[PDB]
Chains A and B, each alone.
Chain A
Amino acid sequence: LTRDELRAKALHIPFPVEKIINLPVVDFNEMMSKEQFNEAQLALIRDIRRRGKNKVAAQNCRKRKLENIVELEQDLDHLKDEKEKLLKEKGENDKSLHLLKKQLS
């Protein structure tokens, strides 16, 4: 039993914590409807929901941060390869032009 589950239990929150967190808004409101909660119960429910949602955005935010550096590092690689492929093409273009310009002075 997590600390969140104990507090909700101690305040007689009849809903499971997972349903407080993960349920969509319309379904959360439906579950919350027809309930005579007091301020303390309302506050703890909203605090459990906010912390629960924000905990996952924090992981996603950190996951995207690291993933973005991998994509940047790859971006770097491909550009250094494309630059080399482009310089190779420029060389064969410069050689063909020079050879034709030579044959005609």
Chain B
Amino acid sequence: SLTDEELVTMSVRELNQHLRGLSKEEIVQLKQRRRTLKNRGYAASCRVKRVTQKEELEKQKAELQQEVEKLASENASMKLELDALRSKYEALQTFARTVA
């Protein structure tokens, strides 16, 4: 007989090379087994494609989220010190004017 992985690997030409002692009905049965196994591989590789898409998208979304969170937080902190420095610069505005 034959095994599963061996059927999927070969082509239709090599499949025609293994018609030893089988009826016409066993021919289509074996051909339908290959198409079924080929279909299982198609669906599986289709799943792996979408899982890879989702994981890679999620890993690179989880990055950008932390990137903008760190950026938003640091800009908030910097704009505080930046506003405070300008406040004291503006305090020296009025004092510089008060002298003559």
Contact = CB atoms under 8 A, between A and B. Distances in A.
Interface of A: 65, 68-69, 72-73, 75-76, 79-80, 82-83, 86-87, 89-90, 93-94, 96-97, 100, 104
A83 B85 CA distance: 26
B82 A83 contact: no
A99 to B, nearest CB: 10
B78 A83 contact: no
Given A90-B75, A100-B86, A83 B54 contact: no
B57 interface: yes
Per CB-CB distance, the 7 closest pairs between chain A and chain B, nearest first, are A79-B64, A86-B71, A72-B57, A82-B68, A83-B68, A97-B82, A75-B61
Interface of B: 50, 53-54, 57-58, 60-61, 64-65, 67-68, 71-72, 74-75, 78-79, 82, 85-86, 89
Given A86-B68, A97-B85, A69 B75 contact: no
A100 B82 CA distance: 9
A96 B61 contact: no
Nearest to A66: B50
Given A73-B57, A86-B75, A89-B75, A79 B82 contact: no
A96 B83 CA distance: 10
A90 B78 contact: yes
Contacts of B60: 76
Contacts of A97: 78, 82, 85
Contacts of A87: 71
A17 B64 CA distance: 50
A76 B57 contact: yes
B68 A93 contact: no
Contacts of B57: 69, 72-73, 76
A90 B86 contact: no
